């Protein structure tokens, strides 16, 4: 009467460790996780999002990624037989989640030679000529912010999409996992909805803490999601949602998607704030009552290398 | 239990008409006015806020205002003398008024001949080489939106404000008042506080339904806070809060000004989410970054047009 989203009497979420919710966009998020590791959402100096830059950026005049160095990214649909893909409120996102053997992935450029000082993020220090390797990212997932939590030179766009994803392979300090973001900005758009993000949002939960098998083939086309003029920015970061892990490669893809008038309103319905009625989440009877949020404040760079990468 | 900026217990704001808030972004706006009037929000097809299209719009590549055409714009600085001007919360918006003569003023091109079929949104038809008038537009008060309510293709920026001014002058249909408002846009900043915010930031009330005297001496530079380069895209609207109504000629300026990150905070915090625990029998304090802002509205076929400053 009403709840943040994150914070419904009726979720059906379980949290291990503090709970933390993004009423102030995150500037609260002190706390532990379940085994009682401290967050450092507050205390990293490589934290996500970051208002990225236009001088020597976004403006195309700084050093950029060489053309062999660029990520490059596979995906085919992602397609449900009725219980292999779900799409999941958290109470903290909308997230889509598999459970089969879904081939979609990128690759990323390494060092050609490596050992434990390498990480995941060398590629934005290398040299234009120097020997790379490659290595292959595997998505874990893929979710939603609105409004975006990357802005692009102090511009935010309607939603954010995120892919996450994992290295296990090559580089010896990822033997247990190295991560790696890929975020698709949409921009409002005065059109018929965008086609593509409707087997998500035609069956997201908006009860918090619950999920939903996606009907049998139902199709995801997550390469098609993706910008086909992939330009990208990429630095250093973090999660942007607790503990706020740093070490991650970030991709910001520069060219916006498009998302309809009401496809955003019925994704900040979804994160959105309730009025609840009491008669234990089964004893409460919610309703979506006012358009919501799911994003964290932008960081500063701290003298981050960011770098601009131009496609072909 | 949160409460909706608007809909604070503590409030002491009065209210003509029907309640509103800004928690759908205006999408549940029908209601009647004080008069039984019909708010037209839902149902006129020139409401604002748009999404300022790319195509034929700001790509520059569209009919655009000619030179002698263009609205010019006025502002010397604002200026307190410790109860001339003031800072309003009203649940709805922060809000700067004057209660001394400011001499802040714009001009908007009208039609040389003119009669009772004429309006100030005239000037988006005529034709660059028209025999043109000018009308004053007066200055009413500024307010203040997060996040920004137009759009320009299809991005968002952290805030906007909006110059109200109403026209008597030289136009038959403006007695008594035809309105225009101007919007700036301040995109995200890295760098320090935009000083230029401050002193309506520094003085901002939290509690809604109160105001706030600025201190003699303090100076609000609204020419300043105004773009200096002053291309804009202007078209028909309406007011953006209930009733709505329309026939408003608008001014979107094209150039950003800048917003620190904790500047961004603080007035969304103003505009903030409650809890609580007679409006003087609650205490209530700020826990939630809000917004105070109207959803955009589709052009429905009006005139867009970009004017290029100089
Ligand atoms: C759907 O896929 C899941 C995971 O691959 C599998 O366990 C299940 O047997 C499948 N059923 C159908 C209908 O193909
Ligand atoms: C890691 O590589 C560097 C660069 O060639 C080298 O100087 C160093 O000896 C290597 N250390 C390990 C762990 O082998
Ligand atoms: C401040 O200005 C107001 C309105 O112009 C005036 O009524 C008042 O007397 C002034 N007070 C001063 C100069 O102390
Ligand atoms: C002015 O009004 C007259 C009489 O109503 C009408 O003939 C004419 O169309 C109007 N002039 C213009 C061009 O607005
Ligand atoms: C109780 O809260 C809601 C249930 O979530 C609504 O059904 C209802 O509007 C409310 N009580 C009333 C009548 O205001
Ligand atoms: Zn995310
Ligand atoms: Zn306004």
């Avoid at 609840?276 to 290398?305: E, H, I, L």
Wanted: hydrophobic share 30%.
């Amino acid at each position: 009467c009403i709840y943040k989203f994150g914070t419904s009497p009726d979720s059906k979420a379980t949290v291990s460790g503090d709970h933390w919710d993004h009423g102030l966009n995150g500037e609260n998020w002190e706390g532990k996780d379940g085994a009682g590791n401290a967050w450092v959402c507050k205390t990293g100096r490589k934290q996500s999002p970051i208002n990225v830059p236009q001088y020597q950026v976004l403006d195309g005049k700084g050093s950029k990624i060489a053309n062999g160095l660029q990520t490059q990214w596979s995906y085919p649909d992602l397609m449900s037989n009725g219980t292999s893909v779900q799409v999941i409120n958290n109470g903290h996102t909308i997230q889509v989640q598999w459970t089969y053997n879904y081939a979609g992935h990128a690759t990323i450029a390494i060092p050609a030679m490596h050992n434990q000082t390498n990480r995941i993020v060398d590629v934005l220090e290398m040299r234009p000529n120097d020997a790379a390797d490659r290595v292959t990212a595997v998505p874990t997932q893929f979710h939603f912010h609105s409004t975006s939590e990357h802005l692009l030179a102090g511009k935010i766009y309607p939603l954010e999409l995120h892919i996450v994803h994992q290295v296990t392979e090559k580089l010896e300090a990822c033997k247990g996992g190295c991560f790696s973001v890929t975020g698709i900005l949409f921009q409002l758009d005065n059109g018929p909805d965008n086609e593509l993000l409707e087997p998500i949002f035609a069956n997201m939960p908006s009860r918090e803490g619950t999920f939903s098998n996606l009907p049998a083939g139902t199709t995801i086309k997550l390469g098609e999601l993706l910008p086909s003029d992939r330009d990208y920015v990429t630095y250093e970061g973090s999660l942007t949602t607790p503990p706020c892990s740093e070490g991650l490669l970030w991709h910001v893809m520069t060219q916006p998607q498009r998302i309809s008038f009401g496809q955003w309103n019925r994704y900040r319905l979804a994160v959105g704030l309730k009025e609840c009625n009491s008669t234990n989440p089964d004893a409460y009877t919610c309703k979506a009552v006012a358009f919501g949020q799911n994003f964290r404040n932008p960081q500063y760079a701290n003298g981050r290398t960011i770098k601009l990468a131009r496609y072909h």
